[PDB]
Amino acid sequence: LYQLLDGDNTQKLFRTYDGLESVAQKLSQDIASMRDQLEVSEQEHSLLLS
Amino acid sequence: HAPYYGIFKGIYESVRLPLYKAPESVLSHVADMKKQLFFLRSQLSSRSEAI
Amino acid sequence: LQNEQEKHQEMRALLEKQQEIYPHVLLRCLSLLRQAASELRLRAQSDIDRI
């Protein structure tokens, strides 16, 4: 689950459970932030069209 | 009753996996969330190039 | 539910393609109207009417 979330990129000698929850929260925030950026891009495109 | 239940509950709330779901569905759900993130990245790149 | 999620993605991809094409059609129409206004009305016709 940690490998699925953070990839192989972090050579963290120790994986923690707080670290697992943090990377899970980050995936959820990255999806939310990309939806918000897409919605801003839709508004900009709608304003250009108008 | 597992001492780790409080931690996995926080992970399920973070990944938006319902508590009634099978525990084997967790890795498959996170893999589909990563697929969704990659799709939204492609979509934003397309739309920014079109603008 | 799965079929309606697939239909959602397919309609969204079709919507995004039409959103890319529509501004370019409007820009071509604006270009033709600008040519009619600047080259024909303000210049070529104005010179005809003076003479």
Side-chain angles (χ1 to χ4, degrees):
Chain A
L1 192 69
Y2 207 107
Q3 253 173 338
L4 208 76
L5 287 171
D6 215 4
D8 284 322
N9 270 348
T10 62
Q11 288 187 346
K12 282 165 186 161
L13 280 162
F14 301 100
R15 299 186 186 169
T16 54
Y17 288 104
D18 292 339
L20 184 67
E21 187 174 16
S22 174
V23 189
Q25 239 176 13
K26 193 181 179 186
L27 180 67
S28 212
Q29 279 178 345
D30 285 349
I31 292 171
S33 180
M34 284 307 267
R35 284 181 177 168
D36 296 347
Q37 283 180 14
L38 192 74
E39 195 170 8
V40 172
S41 176
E42 311 211 273
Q43 287 180 6
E44 286 187 350
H45 193 270
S46 84
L47 235 155
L48 279 166
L49 273 173
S50 173
Chain B
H1 294 302
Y4 300 101
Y5 179 73
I7 298 173
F8 285 108
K9 187 184 175 196
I11 297 167
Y12 293 149
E13 285 175 359
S14 298
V15 191
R16 304 187 179 197
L17 189 77
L19 285 164
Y20 65 78
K21 272 258 181 162
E24 30 259 43
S25 62
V26 176
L27 273 85
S28 39
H29 181 64
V30 174
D32 280 338
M33 285 183 70
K34 270 181 72 188
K35 177 190 171 190
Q36 224 179 27
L37 187 80
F38 202 96
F39 188 76
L40 287 168
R41 265 176 182 171
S42 183
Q43 199 172 22
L44 197 87
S45 193
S46 203
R47 212 167 170 103
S48 70
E49 196 171 7
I51 290 165
Chain C
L1 183 72
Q2 279 185 331
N3 288 351
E4 287 301 340
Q5 284 179 352
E6 284 184 352
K7 195 188 175 194
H8 189 60
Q9 285 199 348
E10 204 177 31
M11 289 189 302
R12 202 169 200 173
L14 281 166
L15 185 71
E16 205 153 42
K17 225 175 188 176
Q18 289 177 22
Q19 286 176 340
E20 188 179 12
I21 297 165
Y22 179 50
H24 273 37
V25 181
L26 291 177
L27 274 164
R28 289 184 303 187
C29 299
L30 258 160
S31 186
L32 292 169
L33 281 166
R34 284 191 176 153
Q35 197 179 0
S38 103
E39 296 195 332
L40 303 174
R41 180 163 183 182
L42 284 168
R43 205 173 191 175
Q45 190 60 47
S46 180
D47 278 325
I48 287 165
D49 293 332
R50 188 180 69 236
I51 299 164

